[PDB]
Every structure is written in structure tokens, then in C-alpha cells.
Symmetry: D2
């Protein structure tokens, strides 16, 4: 029924055999056959299918209102699997500020295989319409994007993809299925780095893919079985476990996000703030129309590099580390940690200023997170 209930009872996460209320961890590679070709429960070799992996796949398919789920050894393995739906000579459109790892996979690996890539500003969907070529086969968007939280209209992107015969893909990592369900808006494929919010505990690297399209699912299954970027059973188990608390975690994160943004906007040491909840944010109305909550990633400007470092040093409850979606709040400086290879003037033109700070809000107490960040900013 409601979302928090679906999180607990959706998918198959018990043992039909013993009745165990959690998914058994099938730390196994192969399965007895009673007769040649006779599989007891459809399992024959763990790369092809493993019952613990099957549990997490059924969870993600249920949570995204899809029919088929796929678990990969990482988010970028999920993305590579989806890209391998294309052939040499095919063209893919992606949002301009797509995740660094995605950019690098496409432009340094798959272009060597003749996949062509155009990055376009998808915040105006007619940009997509202009970028479509006769060879375009896929449209791939994140929304909201990193680290400036740009919002793209999912439903219009799906309509455009249908009209021009494109496979539409949404990287739904930042929003999670708790707040945004692209398959319900006509998208063909949805994917996640489950490394972030879904696992939620910074202890699994994993990717998840869901679709309702039987033919795309057959192609993804063939690619998964042939190139073998499968999630293992222990990690699939930890994923199922972490997803149980997704709704509670996201709701705590959203309460803190709202309060922290109020604080950041009022603070004299903070200039611009980037988050889709701000009503002056580009495509705020679009986000509210396609999601019923918010990501916990916020970016905001302080004065300069030394201000950003001082902020990090002065906070008690914000931890300096890579990734997002932990139970801890995480803090980072994109210009030094994710965009340092880009020339400084291009960074500045892009908005990746030296004093741009990104925080991933965790599940600590809201008052503590607000007060800690505020007192740290007061030291500037």
C-alpha cells in the first residue's frame, strides 16, 4: 500500500523453504541437477542467476514498478551494461553535467567501440530534440545532476524518446525509488548506483537496473551473463537489508535538508545554494511534478578554497570522504576532488568555483547538523 510498507513487504525477501524471514546468502557457484537439464528451482550457475541476487533484483523491480531487475558489481557496471545495448555507429545523448564516471566510461571506453556521444543541456528538452541525429539510439539523463543539482523533465524526455525511437534511461541514484519513479513516467530503463542511498550504509559497491520491457530485459540478461559484472550474494544480501530502512532514512535526510537550506540561505558567509527545493531553482516546478521529495545532496558557495577547507576542519559532524548516501553526513569540495583536472577558468565558467562545497546530508539529528554547519560557517 503506502511506500514504507512496500519497502518492507515488496519483493521476495524470505526463504520459501525454511521460512527464514531474511534472504539466505547463497555463497555458492553451482547447483545439483536431478536429471540433465532438470533444475530444481531454476538455478544452474551463479553467474547466470543466484537466489540472493534474485532477491535484490525482485526488490528493485518492485520499488521502481518494473518487471525485471538486474544487480551489477557497481553503478558503472550497470551503466556499461546498459550502454552495451548499442552497437558501433550508434549515438547516445546524455545530460551535459552527467556523473564523472559515466562521462569517462562513454568518452574513454565506449567511443573506442564506435559509440558516439553528445552531451547536451537537457534542462531544456528542445535541446534534446535539436541534438537527435539519424544514428541516435539512446537518451540517458540524471536528474537531479551532480554537483549543481540540475533538473531535467523526465516525462517530456520519455515522450521525445518514444517519438524518435530512442531507448530512454534515467540514472535515478540521487532521488531513489522512494521519491521518483521514472518507469511510471514512460522511461524504458531506470538504474542506480546502489552504493549510495539504497545500500545506505557505505559498505556495498553495487548497481541496480529495472525495466518493464521484456525485450530490453532479455538483452540486459544476455549482456549480464556474457560480460559478467554481477553482484555477489553477500553484497546482494546487504543491499536488501539496507533498503529496508530507505524510507525512514530518506525522510530524516529530507527534514534536515529543509532546515540546512534555510540556514545556508540566511548565512552571510554563503552565496549561491544549489538544490531543487529552492523555488528560484531552474525547473523547480518540473522536479515537484515528477518527485515527491528531495535528494540529500546540496552544493553551496563559500568565498574560496581556504574558506572551504576551514569549513571542513571546523565541522564536528560532517565527514570528509568520497561518495554520498551514507548514514553519516559527508562533505567535499568538487573543484579539488572531482573536477581538479578541468582547467580553472572552465571550472569557474561552469560554476565549479573554488569555494563550492558539496554536502551529502546523513541521518544525524537535524538540530545538530544545522548548528554544526552554522557554527563552522561562523568561523569564516
Amino acid at each position: 500500500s503506502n511506500k514504507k510498507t512496500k519497502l518492507i513487504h515488496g519483493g521476495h525477501t524470505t526463504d520459501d523453504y525454511t521460512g527464514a524471514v531474511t534472504t539466505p546468502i547463497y555463497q555458492t557457484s553451482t547447483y545439483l541437477q536431478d536429471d540433465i537439464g532438470d533444475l530444481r528451482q531454476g538455478y544452474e550457475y551463479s553467474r547466470t542467476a543466484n537466489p540472493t541476487r534474485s532477491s535484490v533484483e525482485s526488490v528493485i523491480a518492485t520499488l521502481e514498478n518494473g518487471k525485471h531487475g538486474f544487480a551489477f558489481s557497481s553503478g558503472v557496471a550497470a551503466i556499461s551494461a546498459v550502454v552495451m545495448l548499442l552497437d558501433k555507429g550508434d549515438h547516445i545523448i546524455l545530460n551535459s553535467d552527467v556523473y564523472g564516471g559515466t562521462n569517462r566510461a562513454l568518452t574513454k571506453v565506449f567511443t573506442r567501440f564506435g559509440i558516439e556521444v553528445d552531451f547536451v543541456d537537457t534542462t531544456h528538452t528542445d535541446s534534446i530534440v535539436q541534438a537527435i541525429r539519424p544514428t541516435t539510439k539512446m537518451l540517458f539523463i540524471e536528474t537531479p545532476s551532480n554537483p549543481l543539482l540540475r533538473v531535467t523533465d523526465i516525462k517530456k524526455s520519455a515522450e521525445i524518446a518514444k517519438e524518435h525511437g530512442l531507448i530512454s534511461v534515467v540514472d535515478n541514484t540521487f532521488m531513489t525509488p522512494y521519491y521518483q519513479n521514472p518507469l511510471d513516467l514512460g522511461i524504458d530503463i531506470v538504474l542506480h548506483s546502489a552504493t549510495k542511498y539504497l545500500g545506505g550504509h557505505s559498505d556495498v559497491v553495487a548497481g541496480l537496473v529495472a525495466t518493464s520491457d521484456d525485450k530490453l530485459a532479455e538483452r540486459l540478461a544476455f549482456i549480464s551473463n556474457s560480460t559478467g559484472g554481477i553482484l555477489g550474494p553477500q553484497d546482494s544480501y546487504l543491499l536488501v537489508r539496507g533498503i529496508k530502512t530507505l524510507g525512514l532514512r530518506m525522510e530524516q535526510i529530507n527534514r534536515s535538508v529543509i532546515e540546512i537550506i534555510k540556514m545556508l540561505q540566511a548565512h552571510p558567509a554563503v552565496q549561491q545554494v544549489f538544490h531543487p527545493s529552492i523555488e528560484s531553482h531552474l525547473n523547480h516546478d518540473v522536479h515537484m511534478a515528477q518527485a515527491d521529495g528531495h535528494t540529500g545532496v546540496i552544493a553551496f558557495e563559500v568565498k574560496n578554497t581556504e574558506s572551504a577547507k576551514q569549513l571542513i576542519k571546523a565541522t564536528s559532524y560532517y565527514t570528509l570522504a568520497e561518495s554520498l548516501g551514507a548514514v553519516e553526513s559527508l562533505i567535499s569540495v568538487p573543484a579539488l576532488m572531482t573536477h581538479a583536472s578541468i582547467p580553472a577558468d572552465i571550472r569557474a565558467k561552469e560554476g565549479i568555483t573554488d569555494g563550492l562545497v558539496r554536502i551529502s546530508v546523513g541521518i544525524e539529528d537535524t538540530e545538530d547538523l544545522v548548528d554544526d554547519l552554522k557554527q563552522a560557517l561562523d568561523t569564516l
Copy 2:
């Protein structure tokens, strides 16, 4: 010093911090930074590197006398990573009877990316010389092959690859580093499905890659980090653990292999036997020159399908399942389980007769394995 000692003390498989005599399982995705860019022990994000995965990589690099190791979520993920060293328009030579999964990856996935593939009978290395094109960039061989145990000269293949500027690759799964070290014979890259003998307990799906070439290692690391088919920490731990007993397991397996082959050759219900230890086997001398032991996979002919099924039904200690390299002895019928899609007349011409049985010898008692198989064959 000697091999069984190297298996125990080779690589880094203890904890420098606590002194734990086994590798800690770093079930974690990210790492604290003391200052932006300052990594305590070189770790920053588990997809890029994880200390448990690093342990298993150092083991495989040590055991194959390489410098760099890489752990993937499966053998075919290792193979796909190695193939992605090539570009659209490049050509790869492989041995004709290469593993089904490898064949399928190359001909159904990578040909869509403009990689060209020729299967040649590498049991005569001048076949390789004839198949070389101006676009050939890689030579990929298994030895011995499945299920007919064809043997290819590793050292001559490495010489050919060097002369013509090819990346040489050996799939060393069937022999393990305990018996055959292709890097010592001039091969550029060696790889394994660690799912089989290395893990040795049918409870991990994993691939392992080793090289001594710094530039190839940098390219493999980039591909691993970008396409993300990484082995997880729990599976890396189980791999290290299983490798500890590799030498003891392989030696038990070899004792049983020798005795079982004597029995099969004497038995009137058995026709041809396929294994490199048989002195009439093609390239027996080559195998003995490049390896100091044997694989546990044996194929042999009984009369027909019903004879093969009866054999399976009558054995007490041979288990019907996919894969090989378990502690259990495994039995299968290729014509029904791995080559059933190939037309029957082409199967027969290839030697995959209806009564061709493959066994993967386990570590049960040698007398029990010989007597069990013999009494089962007596029922024919």
C-alpha cells in the same frame, strides 16, 4: 621457496595494523581523508581499490610471477576487461574450441563493437601465423581446452605474438598457477576463472588477471575502474582462503587423475579418452614441457546418450552439476549441456559425440573414485 610454501606465504594476506593472520574483510565503500587528497593508506573509494581485493590481487600476481593483479566479479568479466584493451577494427585470434562463454562474449557482444574474431586450430602454431592480419592485435589461447583437452604451445605462441606485435593472453584456468605459469614463458597477460580451481570450493564466482607489463596494467586498471566489474570483499576473502589449499588439492586431484585414466583405458565400455597425460595425445610433449602437472578435467567416450545417463545415475561419488574445480568430483555430458545448440552432425564431426562424458576430478579418495566409476561403467 617451493610451491606449497609460496602458496601460504606469497602475497600480502595479513593485517599490518592489528597483526591478524588473515586478510580483514573491508565491507566498505569509502574512506576517511585526513586532508583533501591525503589518503591514509592509498584507499579512497572501493570500486577503485579495496584492501581485501588488493590482498587477492597480490596473491594472484605472486603466484603467476607477475607484477600486477586484478580481481573481477567473474571469469567472463576478466575476459571482457582484457578484450576491451582493443578498439573497433582490431582483430583477435583465439583457439578454435575456446570456452563457450568466451566464444559468446566475442561473437555476440564485442563484434557489435567492431572487434573482429578468428577461431583457429592453435595446436599447430603456424595456423596462428597464417591467420595473422594487418589488423590483428591480440592472441588469446586456452591450454588445455574444453572438453577435449587440446594443448597449445605457450612459448611459441608468445614468440609469435612478440614478433607480430600482438598482446598475448592465456586463459590458465584448467592448469592453475600451481602447474603452469604463462608469464614465465613470455605471455603478456594471464587470466583465470577463479570460480573453478583457485577458489576450489564452488562458493565464489570470480575472475583473476595478472601481468608484468606496467602499461597493460595501467590500461586494465583504467578499464576496471571505468566499467566496474570488480570482485567484492567477501568473495576476495573466500578466494584468498581457498587458494591456501590449492597445492594440496591439485596434488590429490592429479593422483586420482592418473589412476582414473588407467582404469578408463582398460575398460571395454570406454572408447577414446582425452587428457594431456596420455602419451598418444596431440602435443603431449608440449604440455610436459610447459607444465609440471595436469588438469583434473577428463573427457571420455561411452557408447551413446543412454549409456552416459546410466553412468551418471550409477555413480555414488560423481555429482551432476555445471562448472569444475570443486572439492567434489563433477560429471556432465557436453553434447547435452554445453553444445546442445550445435547441430548433431557438426557435434559428431567435432568429436562431441552423444556418449562423450566429462568429469572434473575432486579430492575424494583415489580408490573410491576409481572403483565408483569402474562399477558404474560395469553396469553398461
Copy 3:
């Protein structure tokens, strides 16, 4: 600072060595010594101490405002360890309706070792004063108790224990350290079945003990090292992980508890309801004075056995299984599942009627849990 922050940052749950943001799983039994007697980080043998177990011990000590934590293979192993502080001839007072497993350990195991036991109604603390003998050494109370949620005054019990020289012990399982901290009220030892709320995911059997008393801690450590009921590293890791979300889980559970109790009190098919939040509940004021929240266990009366079974059959979201503190809501019938050995007339006199149902509220949506239970009760 506040509780939800303490849950995330309290205790030592990162790796000082690599910076891993989660506790490494030290699946190891022994540790290298650089010189005889020189331990690198104080570890020498995992039964005596294991770094993952040490992490969960530091968490429980922090959350209960104690100084020392101890992790056992189960709640009843924790209880047996605490009882083994006593000698033959010593006497222990426990609350009359103490947990079945505790009752059975004391009366069927430890009485054979000359420990004497008296069960008294501790809802009046002068009952304790009357039951004290010259040989009494320990006072052991749960509050609230199972399944009728009887409340005992913790602070008065601690005062009584101090005056008469007793070791005071509170089984704090039902309330968790999120809502009730007995060590702050003068109790000597606090313990939990971490199997329930603390792990929170029905996938670990474990017990946890905390104290601020150095001498009691030394005695507990000696008993743990000598009788060896230690929690393993994988289970300690899963405990730390589950505790991260304790506050969010307990708060969701409490919201649902309040709404479900309103529904049960209004429903004509329900008679008596047992829970400390009801203002007519015995010692309601005491509970509110010693806790700032509620347990998720509720008991209530329907008409008879068949009514109770019908309730179970008609609910969509209440799962029939043993234990409590899961993310799922659990339902059971004490008279059939925990008190079936007690004669029926004594059960009735005790309030364990045939139609007494116990539910352990999970983290499903509050409206769904209320509506599901209400429609099921409507079918009566």
C-alpha cells in the same frame, strides 16, 4: 549531542588504519606478535578480543553511558554470564513475569549450581525489600516485561540494591538505549538481547552488556574469556550496522504504536490493552519518569483462541513468527506459543487468556498497520 547523532558517531566504528568508514570484519582467530608478549594493537586471540567485536562493545558502552561493553553469542548467553558473577549459595531476585528463557536458565540450569532464585512482583519495590535474604546478591529486573508490559521503578530498584549491597541488573531489551538508560539511574549492569531491536533486522542472534563498574567489568571479561559465549565478527558487524538506524526505527515504531493503541481501545472486538503509554496502566507515571519513549510490543485481548487465529489469518502486514524488534510487524499468541506448558487455569489467573494477542510493531506505514489490524478485527 542529540540521540540520533550519538547513534551515528558514538563508539569507534571506523578503521584507523585505512580510514574505512565502516568497521572491518576481522574474520580471524589469532594475531602476529612482533616479539613474545608484544601485541601490535592489543590483540592476541579472538576469543579474548576481536577488533570487530570491540567495535560493537564500544557502541553499546557509549549508547548506555557505560564504560565497558561485552558482546555475547545470544541474549541468554549475556544473562548466563551475568548470573555467573554469583556463587553457590547466592540468591537472586527477579521480576515475577521475567522472560521465559531467563526463567528456564535460572530454575533449570543455575539452581543445579546452588544459585537460589525468588520471583517477586517488582511493580511494588517494597516487594523487593521484603524478599531480600541475608544471602541475596543480585537484583535482576526487566521493564517493561513480556507479554503484559509490567513496569518496574528502575531508580528505586537501584537505591534498594545499593542499600543492601546487591548487584543491580536491568534487561533493557524492550526499551533499547534510545529510550531508557538504566546505568544513568544507578543500575550496576544493563543488558540486551541484541537479537531484537538493536540488530533490528531479524538476522543476528546476539547479546550485549554494558557497565560503568571497573571491577564488575573485569569479572565479566574473565567469565567471557573462560566460558566463551562470544559474538563472532560477522554478527558484530551486522549489529553495528543495524544500530545505525535504531533511532529512526524506534521513532517510526512509536508513531505507529500510538495510533494502533487508539484503534485497539476504540474497537468493540478488543477488551483489555496492555502497554505503558496507556495512562490507566500500572506505573505509567514511573515509566514516563524513567524513559522518553515506548516499546513497540503491545498485548491485547480478543475473545478466544479462534478469534486470535482469525485475526492472524486476516492481517496482510502482520507476520506470524517468534521474536520481536524486526522491521516487519510480528504477531503471536502467548497462550499457544510461550505459555502453552503452563496449566490453563493458571494462565487465565495470570492474564494469559486464550485470546491474548501480542504484536511487535514494525516500521511499515502507520496508516497501513492501523487499517490492516482494524479490518482484521472487523472480521470478528
Copy 4:
């Protein structure tokens, strides 16, 4: 049939449901009931029984030719469970040089519960007959003992126990079920620290108990369920896995033991050597009559403390750490590491000289182990 086959196929270590060829890891605490009291496969609560633990219990029961197996969180938890079969006022006879942990449990924990203990030299079984009191209920022996490898006649001890109505117990850790089966010689209960040879990889702390007596098994099950020192599922899985290679590991260890003893006896820097294979060893004939192999623990005398430390420093392949039964060879000095609390003159009288070294032989190459130890001794 033969032992190495029994190791692979004995016990239930596959999944009847999916056919998985390894035991699933049931990381779970509780089980769905289809109707109140109706258990699908007999599981209801993991402390009482867990399917992974059940797998390892069936293995140990099979390997010791018993009917019932029990897995505990440690060897000393197994021992405490067995001791709790007795009551206050009961008396137990143990061999004089029993393991330190056992001595400490009995004399510092269970004597406080009125269990009486006598340590007697059981190398002469009439010592047992003399020590029997009217209150004696249990006879507990290790053979061979630590660190001087004293041998006790198992079959005569069982006869004595039967005649006088004693529960007979053998701690079979040092020999493993691969070489010595006390239940076959009339002993009531056999137990192991599975931490050592059975797990075999220094990564599990665990105890195992087997019996053929239904009534003793019912009592042990009650004690296990009531005091809760149960092995967890992940550790039970690793135990099953490690036991697979027990036979191969023990046979390698025995080959090295024989060669190392030849070397030690010939070496001028070595005085007395302690091991049951030496024909001048007390009760050598008894050992050969009750076992068909040897433990890997050897003790031998060098001159003094500094000689012992120099030996440790000079060996390349012997690791300084506690415990035994690893794949690594381990080295230690009892007088400094296990008997340092005993006064020096009593140590000397007992044979625990300052230069007494204990090695636990691992599975490294035999020549390497012999040559490494010999060159280290040459440096004296």
C-alpha cells in the same frame, strides 16, 4: 567409504531446495510459521536451531561416528556446556596437564558452583581408578596433551568410566576426527576446539561436540538452548568449508612432522623432543593402537630463553602467534606464553623449561620447513 571421501560427502552440506552445492548461510534469527506451531522445516528461532549450524553439526556427528552434533561459539563454550551436565557436589577427573583454558574454567568458574575437580596423571589409567570418589560423575581427558604431548589410553578410560558410571569425555582437538575417533572406543562425548585444525584457516573461533547417546544429546541441547553459547551461521559455514580439506591438510602436516622430528633428533642444539610418534615416548604403543596418524604439534628443548627467541627470529616460515592448526606453521615458547604465571622452579620440575619451544606444523613444503628450522637451529 574411505576417509577423504567421507570428508567430502559426509553430513548434509547442500541445499535441498535450490540444489546449491554448498550450505546456504542463514543469516536470520526467526522463521515464518504457516500456522501456530507448524514449522515448515523444523526451524522456529535461530538460537534453538539454525540450518547452517545444523549443517556443521551433521558434519561433526558424521566424522566422529556419532548421532548428534552441537556447535558452540568457542572450544571453551563447548567445554562449559559439557561441564554443565554436572550438578553442585559432583566431581570431575581431568588429566593433569589439561589445556590452560580448561583448567581455568574448572578451577576459577565451576568450582564456585560446587563442581569438584581433581587433576590426575592419566598416562596410567589406574591413577584414574584411584582418584574416583563416590561423588565422581565425569572423566575428561585430552590425548595427546599440550605442550608435552602426553598420551592417555582412550579405550581403558572408557571401560573405567562405564564400570563406575561416569560420563566419559575426550577433547579430540589435537588429533581431529581424521585420525582418532573416541566414540568408536566407547567414550560418551567427544569435543573439539574447531578454532584449530577443523576450521584449519585461523579465521573461526568455534567448538564442536558429538555424541551417540540420545539422553546426553537431549541434555546438551537443553543447555545450549538455555545458556546460548551457539556458533553463528557465517562461522558455521566457514567451518564446513575448512573441514572439506581436513584430510589433505592433516596428511601434508604429518609428512612434515615425520621429517622435522628426524631433523630435531639429529640436531646438536636440540635436547629432548616430545611427540607420540617417537618410539621411546611414553604410551607410544597406546597412541598407535587408538589413532592412525599424528598431531602436528611438536615440543622440543633448546638451551635457554635467548636460544628460543633466536630460533624464532631466525626462521623464515614459522610465525610467532598463539593457537595451532593453521595453514601456516606457528611457533611459541610455553614458559613465556602459556605458563608464565607458574613459578619458575615448578615449571622446570614440570618440564616447561625456559628453552622449550612448541611448533604447530602447517602445510608449507616439507623440505622448506625442515631446512628453515634446521638453519635457524644452526645459528645457535
